[PDB]
Design a protein around this ligand. Sequence first.
Ligand SMILES: C=CC1=C(C)[C@@H](Cc2[nH]c(/C=C3N=C(/C=C4\NC(=O)[C@H](C)[C@H]4CC)C(C)=C\3CCC(=O)O)c(CCC(=O)O)c2C)NC1=O
Ligand SMILES: C=CC1=C(C)[C@@H](Cc2[nH]c(/C=C3N=C(/C=C4\NC(=O)[C@H](C)[C@H]4CC)C(C)=C\3CCC(=O)O)c(CCC(=O)O)c2C)NC1=O
Ligand SMILES: C=CC1=C(C)[C@@H](Cc2[nH]c(/C=C3N=C(/C=C4\NC(=O)[C@H](C)[C@H]4CC)C(C)=C\3CCC(=O)O)c(CCC(=O)O)c2C)NC1=O
Ligand SMILES: C=CC1=C(C)[C@@H](Cc2[nH]c(/C=C3N=C(/C=C4\NC(=O)[C@H](C)[C@H]4CC)C(C)=C\3CCC(=O)O)c(CCC(=O)O)c2C)NC1=O
Ligand SMILES: CCC1=C(C)/C(=C/C2=NC(=C\c3[nH]c(/C=C4\NC(=O)[C@H](C)[C@H]4CC)c(C)c3CCC(=O)O)/C(CCC(=O)O)=C2C)NC1=O
Ligand SMILES: CCC1=C(C)/C(=C/C2=NC(=C\c3[nH]c(/C=C4\NC(=O)[C@H](C)[C@H]4CC)c(C)c3CCC(=O)O)/C(CCC(=O)O)=C2C)NC1=O
Ligand SMILES: CCC1=C(C)/C(=C/C2=NC(=C\c3[nH]c(/C=C4\NC(=O)[C@H](C)[C@H]4CC)c(C)c3CCC(=O)O)/C(CCC(=O)O)=C2C)NC1=O
Ligand SMILES: CCC1=C(C)/C(=C/C2=NC(=C\c3[nH]c(/C=C4\NC(=O)[C@H](C)[C@H]4CC)c(C)c3CCC(=O)O)/C(CCC(=O)O)=C2C)NC1=O
Ligand SMILES: CCC1=C(C)/C(=C/C2=NC(=C\c3[nH]c(/C=C4\NC(=O)[C@H](C)[C@H]4CC)c(C)c3CCC(=O)O)/C(CCC(=O)O)=C2C)NC1=O
Ligand SMILES: CCC1=C(C)/C(=C/C2=NC(=C\c3[nH]c(/C=C4\NC(=O)[C@H](C)[C@H]4CC)c(C)c3CCC(=O)O)/C(CCC(=O)O)=C2C)NC1=O
Ligand SMILES: CCC1=C(C)/C(=C/C2=NC(=C\c3[nH]c(/C=C4\NC(=O)[C@H](C)[C@H]4CC)c(C)c3CCC(=O)O)/C(CCC(=O)O)=C2C)NC1=O
Lengths: 172, 172, 172, 172, 44, 162, 162, 162, 231, 96
Amino acid sequence: MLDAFAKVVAQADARGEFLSNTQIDALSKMVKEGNQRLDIVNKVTSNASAIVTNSARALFAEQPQLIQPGGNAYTSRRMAACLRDMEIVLRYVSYAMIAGDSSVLDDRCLNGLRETYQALGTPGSSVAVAIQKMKDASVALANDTTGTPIGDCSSLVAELAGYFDRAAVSVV
Amino acid sequence: MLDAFAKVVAQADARGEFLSNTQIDALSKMVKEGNQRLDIVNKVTSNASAIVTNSARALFAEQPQLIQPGGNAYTSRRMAACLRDMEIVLRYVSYAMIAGDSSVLDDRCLNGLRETYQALGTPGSSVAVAIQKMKDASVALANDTTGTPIGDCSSLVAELAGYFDRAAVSVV
Amino acid sequence: MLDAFAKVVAQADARGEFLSNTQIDALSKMVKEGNQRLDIVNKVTSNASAIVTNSARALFAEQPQLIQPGGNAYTSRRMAACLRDMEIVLRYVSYAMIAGDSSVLDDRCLNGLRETYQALGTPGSSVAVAIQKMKDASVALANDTTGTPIGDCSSLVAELAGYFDRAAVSVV
Amino acid sequence: MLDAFAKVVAQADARGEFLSNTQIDALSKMVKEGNQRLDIVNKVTSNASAIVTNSARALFAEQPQLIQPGGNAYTSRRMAACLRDMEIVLRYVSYAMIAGDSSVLDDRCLNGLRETYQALGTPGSSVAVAIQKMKDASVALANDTTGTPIGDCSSLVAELAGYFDRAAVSVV
Amino acid sequence: EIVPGSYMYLSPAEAAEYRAQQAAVSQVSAAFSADVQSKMAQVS
Amino acid sequence: MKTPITEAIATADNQGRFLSNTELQAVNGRYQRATASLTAAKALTGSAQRLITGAAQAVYNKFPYTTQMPGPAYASSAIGKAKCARDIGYYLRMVTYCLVVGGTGPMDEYLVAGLEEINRSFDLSPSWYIEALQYIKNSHGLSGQVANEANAYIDYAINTLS
Amino acid sequence: MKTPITEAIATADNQGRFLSNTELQAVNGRYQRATASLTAAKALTGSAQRLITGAAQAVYNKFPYTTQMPGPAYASSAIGKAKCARDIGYYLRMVTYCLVVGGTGPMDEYLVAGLEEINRSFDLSPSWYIEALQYIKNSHGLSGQVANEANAYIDYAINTLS
Amino acid sequence: MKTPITEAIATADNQGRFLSNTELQAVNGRYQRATASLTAAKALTGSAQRLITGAAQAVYNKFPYTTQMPGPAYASSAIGKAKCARDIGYYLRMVTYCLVVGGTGPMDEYLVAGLEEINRSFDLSPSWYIEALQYIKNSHGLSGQVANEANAYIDYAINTLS
Amino acid sequence: SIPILKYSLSTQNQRVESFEVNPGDEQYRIYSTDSLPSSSEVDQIIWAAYRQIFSEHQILKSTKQPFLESQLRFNQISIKDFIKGLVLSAPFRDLNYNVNNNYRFVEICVQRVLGRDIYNEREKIAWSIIIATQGLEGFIDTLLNTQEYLSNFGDSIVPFQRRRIIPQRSKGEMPFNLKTPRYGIEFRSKLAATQFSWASPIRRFRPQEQQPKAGDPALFLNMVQEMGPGL
Amino acid sequence: DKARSRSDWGNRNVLPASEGDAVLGRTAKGAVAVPEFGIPQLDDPVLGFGPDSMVDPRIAEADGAVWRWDAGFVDESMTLASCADISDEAVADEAF
Ligand SMILES: C=CC1=C(C)[C@@H](Cc2[nH]c(/C=C3N=C(/C=C4\NC(=O)[C@H](C)[C@H]4CC)C(C)=C\3CCC(=O)O)c(CCC(=O)O)c2C)NC1=O
Ligand SMILES: C=CC1=C(C)[C@@H](Cc2[nH]c(/C=C3N=C(/C=C4\NC(=O)[C@H](C)[C@H]4CC)C(C)=C\3CCC(=O)O)c(CCC(=O)O)c2C)NC1=O
Ligand SMILES: C=CC1=C(C)[C@@H](Cc2[nH]c(/C=C3N=C(/C=C4\NC(=O)[C@H](C)[C@H]4CC)C(C)=C\3CCC(=O)O)c(CCC(=O)O)c2C)NC1=O
Ligand SMILES: C=CC1=C(C)[C@@H](Cc2[nH]c(/C=C3N=C(/C=C4\NC(=O)[C@H](C)[C@H]4CC)C(C)=C\3CCC(=O)O)c(CCC(=O)O)c2C)NC1=O
Ligand SMILES: CCC1=C(C)/C(=C/C2=NC(=C\c3[nH]c(/C=C4\NC(=O)[C@H](C)[C@H]4CC)c(C)c3CCC(=O)O)/C(CCC(=O)O)=C2C)NC1=O
Ligand SMILES: CCC1=C(C)/C(=C/C2=NC(=C\c3[nH]c(/C=C4\NC(=O)[C@H](C)[C@H]4CC)c(C)c3CCC(=O)O)/C(CCC(=O)O)=C2C)NC1=O
Ligand SMILES: CCC1=C(C)/C(=C/C2=NC(=C\c3[nH]c(/C=C4\NC(=O)[C@H](C)[C@H]4CC)c(C)c3CCC(=O)O)/C(CCC(=O)O)=C2C)NC1=O
Ligand SMILES: CCC1=C(C)/C(=C/C2=NC(=C\c3[nH]c(/C=C4\NC(=O)[C@H](C)[C@H]4CC)c(C)c3CCC(=O)O)/C(CCC(=O)O)=C2C)NC1=O
Ligand SMILES: CCC1=C(C)/C(=C/C2=NC(=C\c3[nH]c(/C=C4\NC(=O)[C@H](C)[C@H]4CC)c(C)c3CCC(=O)O)/C(CCC(=O)O)=C2C)NC1=O
Ligand SMILES: CCC1=C(C)/C(=C/C2=NC(=C\c3[nH]c(/C=C4\NC(=O)[C@H](C)[C@H]4CC)c(C)c3CCC(=O)O)/C(CCC(=O)O)=C2C)NC1=O
Ligand SMILES: CCC1=C(C)/C(=C/C2=NC(=C\c3[nH]c(/C=C4\NC(=O)[C@H](C)[C@H]4CC)c(C)c3CCC(=O)O)/C(CCC(=O)O)=C2C)NC1=O
């Protein structure tokens, strides 16, 4: 997989180049954000079961057909596999957040997921609503200031919510 | 796989219903003629080798181009594979006779079998002739009155004839 | 796999026939040139590393963009996979020269190789240039008399040049 | 496998105790030794091909019966395994240096190595000679103050030498 | 000893036959030493 | 156990590798954060009895049926009250073991592996233990990056029970 | 199949290796033998119609119940007698196929694989075919190393039936 | 890529887990080292052509047969000197990639994988490139922890060739 | 005695060498009992074998085999017997074998036990008659006793998807659990409690997916949280 | 509404469509914005990244533009490269 420092090395090599001082100075701007990026994945990991079950509870309150007899999240083995899917997607968005780009999310999670749900009969447009409810549960948690020094991590909040958007358009 | 009893249950669970009183009474009618159902698969199993080898012998008398050179049943390996295909299909019809429905016949035997014979170059219409030659051979045994109390099994024999007929249209 | 002799039997079994007198004498012609066929494959495998490393060196001087940055044989692993594939192709061509037909070359070397190269971005028309460079580096060596009794084996060299032409058109 | 921090935890759980302040303050002394420990491991891993090759070449100089025809280092497949066995032990000693205790040296390298060498006929006393020649080749390198701040780290070279004695008495 | 890792275990009769057949090729490397006197203008 | 040191060795032994700068930097990140986590384990150890008796009382205020309902699963007898404060001490002890080691290794081996068969058999409720661990998170009195280290292993135990 | 040429390619391809002199010495032993194998395959083909009817009449003398006992598995009808000589000709044809290829390659796929299920299902006794093959071994009329190659594949088919 | 970041994601994903503090400390140790490791890449890039044409001349001093002996594998022509200084710059550029990434990622993918098969086929002796890397190891001019980062990747390249 | 029928090979990644000394982050974590693991590390071998044979979605409490686990912890069975014992287990027959036919069950067990894809369609046809005539117990024994299993994994390594990513690339072949789920397009129709087979995206009158434009004040929001110190 | 809060990144807005709409500091994906070009090593026609040095295959998966769900993935099944050259005379005369 690639991280954000390995994505610039692969672009540079493909043209047989060194890295200029302008490119190095933009990679040490990525290092200085290093402790605020680690606080964001720590807040998502530490609350990871309340992200998943509060947003699954919300998903069936407003789409109650999914848990009725004949639905897809009916019959508790399929209920447990439904919550497994939300923890899986939340796991790889957490991986793509420390890496700095979404390549481990793209080929280990999202690659072939839309075609998997069509072979199972799972509503892939309702999985995207499940990802979108974990999106703002995780954003409201990362904007929350508890346990953190004063300062700024607002360009990183917009980045974490973009991996949740990429995961949600790849499944519809 | 399902039997006749779990077929009603799996259909009732997708509606979220209990079974009605006319569904329990239609199930207890299967129990009343359960001894005559077991006498049918006792006749078929006990002569299962003679059903296969007599109907295969009659298939090549009337289709003598299967065992000419170039034919699909010409070698030692292609001919013994024709005999075991008849013994597989005759085995999965008797699995559908004690179950009550053709759910083990469709899932384990007939699913994707027409496309397999098309990939092998096996003439699928002649496999249907061999299944129909096994149909009347085991119906003639099912109507035998030896070692049984005399009664009416004619609705059960017409069900066994429908399992061989389903296998013969699912293979061409 | 089949060789040349087993190919003739496979033609004759499908017609259910004994071999004729002319088919026997055509087979005793292949036995007569057996020492000239064994002498070719000995000439090719004894120089097998030099066929590959010189036909590659002529390819990168003719198409120099393959070793420039971004080129398909630019890194030490992409350079070593190029010399691997030429050695694989030359290996199965040597197999098809003692057998007498290209049955092992089609099944065990070429099956799906064109679609493998399209998915990689490897230029399939450049792989065909490197196989034709291995063709006339092997044909020129098979026509060399140093070590062999003097005689004409030009029909065998026109057969070896057809296995190289078969793999060259089956890669693009 | 365990490190030194989990060695003191596995012993406190077996008596159901919290760690006392003395065991905590003895662990934070190991933390401030941590930069000097990473210097020793870096000094070995960057000279690893010359630790193996020189102490091998110094072993077949004073023991020429090993590489004489009939010896247990003749016939380069056995010579390649003697160089692998030297590299394996030096690898797992440097693993037990960053850990702080030899639990990874004991199980996945040294458990069953006297038993293995006695099965093959390898002279296990000559292996102990080779292990003690990589000991004083890397004790001498960890005492080298090239590119380090000059402080005192004599207690960790007496620790690193002990893991080489542990592997040398375990094969004889 | 042939080379320091390759050896010949022969009987004391047949070890004379090994040494007196490579002195029987030492009289033809005394004869291709006159291939250096005719380095130029050999077969004219 | 899963420590940051045995997870750097295992990824280097899987590759047949000597310890490169990928692995020396990872062990160095353990040694940097070990100053903040060795004072969290020292401050949780020294105030342990204040935390155990407090966290067991926080279960009794929240779920007061556990002191009134008869039966062996509940803290209604004096035997069943000492078995509760025993269990709170087990969870607090594993958190200090993870702070000195770094990484959720001691409680993955001693506590969470086989825990659901214990709670199912003896009819213990995992929401009793979440309420006890949420007291210790709010009452350990740490601050800064010392509280950040301690709360990261409290929340691991809650996520295995939730 | 089981040509010596394909049984030399299959060992070199398993290691992923070129053809060494180990394989070229193997194929050279096929070519130094094929001057006797191809004179035996032509001599059996040119005397086939004498050999089939002679071997089919020999099993009627040894086992006379085949021409008398009713049932589809016996040579009492004209349908059963034409299928009996058909089977003798199938054994002689795979013998002459195995001589021009070298080694028991053609008769494995075409005659031996699945033979035991045919004789069990249609109730054909394998001792009828052994009596027929013992006639051909006695009176093919060959001698020298020509007859050694013919009896090598006759006795292979006897060993699979016995 | 053998980044400390992608090695942390891989140990978490091996057991299907979220990223705990075991893996966040490996990422944190990369950031503490990334200051000295990025000033080394800036200074090696700025002295690139000085170090490349110097290290090429040091190979022609120690191995003067490489400029005299005829053949395609040697630097005895104008093309062989252009391809020789191409290869010094390849080894230098991969070192600087490892300094901006952290850990021996780019050197393993782009340089070391398949190097032994190339140096055997084209008859390139690996002792030339060891001499060229020992020049850069002595002439980059850095000191402190900045040279300590730089030499750890010059030494890693020498251990692969040796 | 009915040998298996012959099929043709195909070009795949695992048939050919990667010249990769020093593998990277895409090396796929050998789990072996040849490294003498402790109790905490034999739990990781067991979870890796459950993930490989079952899905991640079938590692429920009702699925785990507690007695097959304890015979591995006492060195009574090998990892090849753990993998065989998971395929012949009652959860695997119920959730996977009963909702596939014989041809799609072969390609599940080739992908998950051998760690490679099928060569062609005729390889599914060739192996599906080992199931129908000998059962699952005979099919998994002739699949674990191939030379493809004993050379790659032996008898003490958990299988893995062999050679999924090429060493330069960032996008590799699809993982075998996302490529082949529990049941396919047949058995989907009505045999697995399913309706309507597709769904349009959810409509709403509060749009929820508005893309920001170039003058929006949240793109400059950066240092809005707090001003930097100094003078 | 505009993206105002850092709290509404999870609630309402998704991510910048184009890279000119990125956050103050970063690219469209969210990583830090680094200049694409460094110093070229070995400026040379025959040996060096010339104009016709073919593209890295690992430049797209490193981009993340090969995966279909990411915005960089352009599909060329409907672009002009997939249309037949009419100047080819084999294609004109057949299609006449
Ligand atoms: C062990 C794993 C591990 C972590 C979890 C982090 C934890 C962590 N974060 C910060 C430090 C910080 N963390 C934040 C983050 C935030 N503050 C806020 O108001 C926001 C709510 C939130 C961002 C979303 C800020 C703003 C700083 C310090 C200011 C700065 O670095 O410029 C520091 C101290 C660095 C310093 O002193 O400069 C540490 C150790 N680092 C690690 O190594
Ligand atoms: C476990 C072994 C087992 C079996 C193999 C079957 C066979 C079987 N069937 C019946 C019992 C019966 N079997 C038949 C069946 C038939 N009558 C006909 O005229 C048809 C030829 C044929 C149906 C095709 C009928 C009609 C009865 C009912 C008895 C009766 O009507 O008098 C009985 C005796 C019990 C009784 O008298 O009711 C037995 C042993 N049942 C078993 O328990
Ligand atoms: C065991 C290993 C083994 C080998 C490596 C080969 C090599 C080999 N070739 C020949 C023998 C021969 N080889 C050749 C072949 C050639 N002569 C030419 O002038 C061309 C350069 C080339 C054809 C491409 C010819 C023409 C003969 C002699 C006539 C013939 O065999 O038809 C012979 C002796 C047989 C004879 O004298 O006829 C041998 C042993 N055969 C083997 O059994
Ligand atoms: C990324 C990888 C990495 C490293 C390689 C080390 C590198 C390193 N070593 C030291 C610092 C030191 N390193 C050593 C070790 C030694 N000095 C000697 O004279 C001996 C030869 C050798 C021990 C046997 C000593 C002794 C000090 C402290 C100076 C002193 O008191 O003598 C420091 C300064 C911090 C401190 O003072 O502790 C650093 C960064 N750290 C890392 O993070
Ligand atoms: C690591 C990357 C990865 C992903 C993402 C993944 C997804 C995945 N989800 C699956 C099933 C499932 N997915 C769902 C999910 C849902 N159903 C709903 O109604 C909801 C809308 C939704 C979530 C709440 C359900 C119910 C199943 C069970 C299908 C079944 O067996 O009946 C399956 C079928 C295999 C099986 O169940 O054994 C796969 C492969 N697998 C992976 O390996
Ligand atoms: C789902 C349960 C199931 C069935 C029923 C099944 C059948 C099946 N029949 C097959 C072949 C075959 N089947 C036949 C059978 C016939 N051809 C004829 O001419 C006759 C009409 C007919 C005999 C009545 C033949 C000739 C072959 C191929 C043998 C060969 O190609 O060598 C094969 C290919 C395997 C092989 O080559 O041996 C399968 C998988 N497989 C299954 O998994
Ligand atoms: C059946 C026998 C068989 C063959 C032949 C085979 C080929 C094969 N060649 C491959 C790659 C390759 N093939 C080439 C070859 C070339 N590129 C060029 O520019 C040249 C024109 C050409 C040869 C000189 C290169 C450079 C790679 C891998 C690197 C990449 O494409 O990214 C790969 C991808 C996996 C890997 O790289 O290891 C396979 C599977 N596989 C097989 O199983
Ligand atoms: C758990 C990690 C691990 C260890 C520790 C290990 C040891 C090991 N060393 C072996 C052989 C060997 N080891 C040596 C080493 C030596 N012989 C000498 O005379 C010298 C004194 C010494 C070299 C300095 C030799 C020559 C062999 C080959 C023995 C043979 O195959 O006959 C073998 C037999 C397999 C083989 O032939 O390669 C094993 C299993 N293998 C492992 O996987
Ligand atoms: C180190 C890892 C570890 C854990 C986690 C552990 C838990 C554990 N708690 C137990 C019982 C118990 N735990 C409780 C605790 C409670 N019930 C209540 O009502 C209170 C609300 C709550 C206290 C907070 C009680 C009352 C029992 C006795 C159950 C019984 O005896 O049936 C038992 C049964 C045996 C015994 O201790 O007597 C185990 C094994 N044991 C371990 O070795
Ligand atoms: C190429 C390899 C090959 C062999 C070996 C082969 C044997 C073969 N012999 C058969 C029948 C037969 N074979 C015989 C032959 C005999 N019975 C006797 O009593 C005589 C002693 C003996 C003659 C020597 C008879 C009478 C039948 C008919 C049996 C029946 O139809 O039930 C049948 C059943 C179909 C048919 O041909 O009518 C096969 C498949 N088929 C093959 O494709
Ligand atoms: C990015 C990683 C990478 C490396 C390391 C690499 C090395 C490399 N060096 C090569 C050739 C060469 N390398 C040299 C270099 C030298 N010979 C000498 O005498 C000098 C002492 C020495 C210079 C230090 C020469 C002369 C050739 C041409 C050899 C030939 O074409 O046969 C070739 C053959 C193709 C070519 O470039 O012409 C490769 C693949 N390629 C890569 O992609």
